[PDB]
Amino acid sequence: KPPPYKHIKVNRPIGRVQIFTADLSEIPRCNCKATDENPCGIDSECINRMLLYECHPTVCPAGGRCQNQCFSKRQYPEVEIFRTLQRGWGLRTKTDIKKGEFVNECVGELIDEEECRARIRYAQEHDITNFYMLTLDKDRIIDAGPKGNYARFMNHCCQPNCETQKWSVNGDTRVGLFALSDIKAGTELTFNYNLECLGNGKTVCKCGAPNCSGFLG
Ligand SMILES: C[S@@+](CC[C@H](N)C(=O)[O-])C[C@H]1O[C@@H](n2cnc3c(N)ncnc32)[C@H](O)[C@@H]1O
Ligand SMILES: [Ca+2]
Ligand SMILES: [Ca+2]
Ligand SMILES: [Zn+2]
Ligand SMILES: [Zn+2]
Ligand SMILES: [Zn+2]
């Protein structure tokens, strides 16, 4: 059984950490029509989607059928946690996911470098080998360990089927997972941690890909 965690829907800023807000002047304005085949969708000419911005619902001309509100809408593909051989607990999809489709948001407690330094330090001193830390920016780190969602079970892979993207939503950064290719129902959902994830120093990569570098990210 996986150790408990508080299931949260949005990022939770801790201590000095701030969650900022901008106006409509700091957001592009697309010209997608309600009559388009997939208004503001994965293959459209939506200037907001292209610049990694969501559309503002009350001003998007595509209106009600705007397809560029994936973070705000929190509609994720059906997933489940399962027991992997060597990388502990993992996350697999229960439904087919298409290339470029939104998979999840990396949601956790938003912490600063001082709080992140104390939590790695405690984990190191107490032989904790599982980390759920992801850089939002130089000032803010997502920690999905105490509080999070299903994204926290997604393992690293040198040949992943997902990627992270830094999007602007309501005037602040959010981290989302998007499919790098079509993913079949039953497959483990992975992403390359790259330099984004903290604490995994001397961790040996067990992704088992033919192009494995031996290290996490
Ligand atoms: C975000 S958690 C992923 C869920 C985790 N496997 C669990 O059981 O809760 C990442 C942690 O899982 C382990 N891990 C993830 N991907 C791995 C990989 N490719 N090779 C080895 N360990 C991995 C590491 O201990 C890492 O700190
Ligand atoms: Ca729009
Ligand atoms: Ca818009
Ligand atoms: Zn659009
Ligand atoms: Zn739109
Ligand atoms: Zn690997």
Swiss-Prot record:
Outcome after substituting T187E: Does not affect histone methyltransferase activity. Increases methyltransferase activity
Top-level taxonomic group: Eukaryota
SET domain span: 77-194
Tissue: Expressed in the embryo and the outer region of the uterine decidua at early post-implantation 5.5 dpc stage. Uniformly expressed in embryonic and extraembryonic tissues during gastrulation stage 7.5 dpc. Expressed differentially after stage 14.5 dpc with highest expression in proliferating cells. Enriched in the telencephalic region of the brain, spinal cord, intestinal crypt, tooth buds, thymus and salivary glands at stage 16.5 dpc. Also expressed in the ossification region of developing bones and in the periosteum.
Effect of C157S: Increases methyltransferase activity towards H3 and H4. Increases methyltransferase activity
Sequence positions that bind S-adenosyl-L-methionine: R87, G88, W89, T129, N130, F131, Y132, N155, H156, N200, K206
Location(s), subcellular: Nucleus; Chromosome
Domain Post-SET: 201-217
Annotated segments matching region Inhibits enzyme activity in the absence of bound histone: 195-201
AWS domain boundaries: 25-75
Comment on protein domains: Contains 2 adjacent but distinct nuclear receptor interaction domains (NID+L and NID-L) to which nuclear receptors bind differentially in the presence and absence of ligand respectively.
Task performed by this protein: Transcriptional intermediary factor capable of negatively influencing transcription. May also positively influence transcription. Essential for early post-implantation development.
Subunit (UniProt): Interacts with AR DNA- and ligand-binding domains. Interacts with the ligand-binding domains of RARA and THRA in the absence of ligand; in the presence of ligand the interaction is severely disrupted but some binding still occurs. Interacts with the ligand-binding domains of RXRA and ESRRA only in the presence of ligand. Interacts with ZNF496.
Family classification: Belongs to the class V-like SAM-binding methyltransferase superfamily.
Name this protein carries in UniProt: Histone-lysine N-methyltransferase, H3 lysine-36 specific
Taxonomic path: Eukaryota, Metazoa, Chordata, Craniata, Vertebrata
Gene name per UniProt: Nsd1
Parent-record interval covered: 1764 to 1980 of 2588
